[PDB]
Structures are given as structure tokens and as C-alpha cells.
């Protein structure tokens, strides 16, 4: 996250980090005690991955961390139908053992398609993660967060040569300087509705980070909430 600020411990208790052949390579959000939602581009391959919930400072011990192994990865079935488009950039991770919910480990709410879109169109969301804090620079030790405004679709389209599908939205500032960035992918874009946070996007892709005239691109979760609910059922 470029231009954000340090989270407090427990401020984003749905946020997790992913570790694997690269440490802290992506974020995710807790759907429930057994499932994480992340970006599909974080989890191409069947390479092994761990999830750490209750994380705050990735170089220190807080005694709030819960580490789990990923035993199943479900990328959206239409991800990579078309190469290098990052359309449908969303995936689910099943954990080997349930998370134990507490103040530091708490799911994000997920509304139906209509209300996820209403919440998105409220126009202001929070993004968070341990990704780069400068374009081509170092990753964060302490979880970062940033409020980003929604950007209108036509402005979104003019801002890049790459295709923005209806499964994406733009967010960020017309003047630049504040954005998600490398390493933040898979983490949440959330909308706070009278003290209760709902998942409205997944951090997906961009061009460089925080450049004026460019915006962060996010997977539009309203299009995927039926799929999330179908695949993550607890029984």
C-alpha cells in the first residue's frame, strides 16, 4: 500500500497474509473459519502455501497469529480463460484446520450481489495489506491501510490501454500518490456500513503504483458472491 498508514492491531481482523516460495506475497480475507478469499493470480500452480491470520507485524511476534496450511485452491473457473487479462481474478483457499475466531481473527461480511454493488457504489472503500509502500520499493512490516474513492467507469477506461471488464472496478485518486501495490493482491477492498464491513473488491492489478492518471484495479466481488457462498459452505 502506497501512501497509507499503519493499521492498529485488530483493526482489520479479516485480513490474512499468504506465505510460500515467497514470503508475504499476497493478502486474503477470511470468509469463515475454513476459507480464505484471495486473487487467483496469487495462486496459480499447486505450489504449497500457508495463511497467517491475526497478523500485524510480519517480522515480530504478537501472539495473535494463527498459521494454517492450504489444502485446496479453487480459482474462479473462468480465470485464465483468456490470457493475461486478469479477468475473474479471485480464488478460494481451504484451510487444513479451522481458524479460531476472536478479536484478531474475524470474517469479513459478504452481502448478496445487489447489496455488494450498492455498498461499492457508496464510493469509498478501505484496502489493506503488506505490499510495497513505494512503487519498486520495500514491502511493509506493519499492516497498511488506505481509503480509496471509487472511480467512474469512463474515467477508468481512459486511464489505461488495457481492458477493464465488467468484473473489475477502478479506485484511487485523480492526483495519484495513494494506491495498492505489488504484494497487496488478494487482500480486501471493504466498505464499512454503519460499523459493519462488507467485502466489495479484491486487490487485483495496476500499472506501476500510485501514478497520477492511473488507478488501482479491483475484482468486482458483487459478480462472485454467489460463487463464494456456493463453494465455502460449512457443514
Amino acid at each position: 500500500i502506497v501512501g497509507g498508514e499503519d493499521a492498529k492491531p485488530g483493526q482489520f481482523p479479516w485480513q490474512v497474509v499468504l506465505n510460500g516460495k515467497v514470503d508475504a506475497f499476497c493478502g486474503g480475507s477470511i470468509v469463515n473459519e475454513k476459507w480464505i478469499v484471495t486473487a487467483a493470480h496469487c495462486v496459480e500452480t499447486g505450489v504449497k502455501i500457508t495463511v497467517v491470520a491475526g497478523e500485524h507485524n510480519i517480522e515480530e511476534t504478537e501472539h495473535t497469529e494463527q498459521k494454517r496450511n492450504v489444502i485446496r485452491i479453487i480459482p474462479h473457473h473462468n480465470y485464465n480463460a483468456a490470457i493475461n487479462t486478469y479477468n475473474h481474478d479471485i480464488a478460494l483457499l481451504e484451510l487444513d484446520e479451522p481458524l479460531v475466531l476472536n478479536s484478531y481473527v474475524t470474517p469479513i461480511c459478504i452481502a448478496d450481489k445487489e447489496y455488494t454493488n450498492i455498498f461499492l457504489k457508496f464510493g469509498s472503500g478501505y484496502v489493506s495489506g503488506w505490499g510495497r509502500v513505494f512503487h519498486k520499493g520495500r514491502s511493509a512490516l506493519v499492516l497498511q491501510y488506505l481509503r480509496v474513492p471509487l472511480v467512474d467507469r469512463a474515467t477508468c477506461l481512459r486511464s489505461t490501454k488495457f481492458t477493464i471488464t465488467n468484473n473489475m472496478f477502478c479506485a484511487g485518486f485523480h492526483e495519484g500518490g495513494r494506491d495498492s501495490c505489488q504484494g497487496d493482491s488478494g487482500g480486501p477492498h471493504v466498505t464499512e456500513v454503519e460499523g459493519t464491513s462488507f467485502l466489495t473488491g479484491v486487490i487485483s492489478w495496476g500499472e506501476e503504483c500510485a501514478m497520477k492518471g492511473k488507478y488501482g484495479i479491483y475484482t468486482k466481488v458483487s459478480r462472485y458472491v454467489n460463487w463464494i457462498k456456493e463453494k465455502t459452505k460449512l457443514t
Binding site: 492498529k8 492491531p9 485488530g10 483493526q11 481482523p13 479479516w14 475466531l101 476472536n102 478479536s103 484478531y104 481473527v105 474475524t106 470474517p107 469479513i108 461480511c109 459478504i110 452481502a111 448478496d112 447489496y115 471493504v190 456500513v193 454503519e194 460499523g195 459493519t196 464491513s197 462488507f198
Partner: protein, 51 residues
Amino acid sequence: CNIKNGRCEQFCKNSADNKVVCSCTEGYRLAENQKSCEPAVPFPCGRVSVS
């Protein structure tokens, strides 16, 4: 549900005779005022509880 979401804290659906039915997401219960949402589990989704 037209204005202020029928005054539902979370979700509103149009019923009949101009009236609303509010509802809440998983882990919450429709409070008795029939508008607000109250936690129905110890760690409901989307809530900061660390203080």
C-alpha cells in the same frame, strides 16, 4: 426501501402495502425494533472488537 434503505441497518426488501422487511447478514439477528442488526454470535463478521 427507496429512501434510507427502508431504515434497515443492513438489508431491505419491498413487501406489500408500501412496507418493508429488514434482514441481516450471517451472525446477526434482526433486533426487536425490526430495523437494526445485533450480533448473534461472539465474533460476527465485519466487526472490530479489539478496541
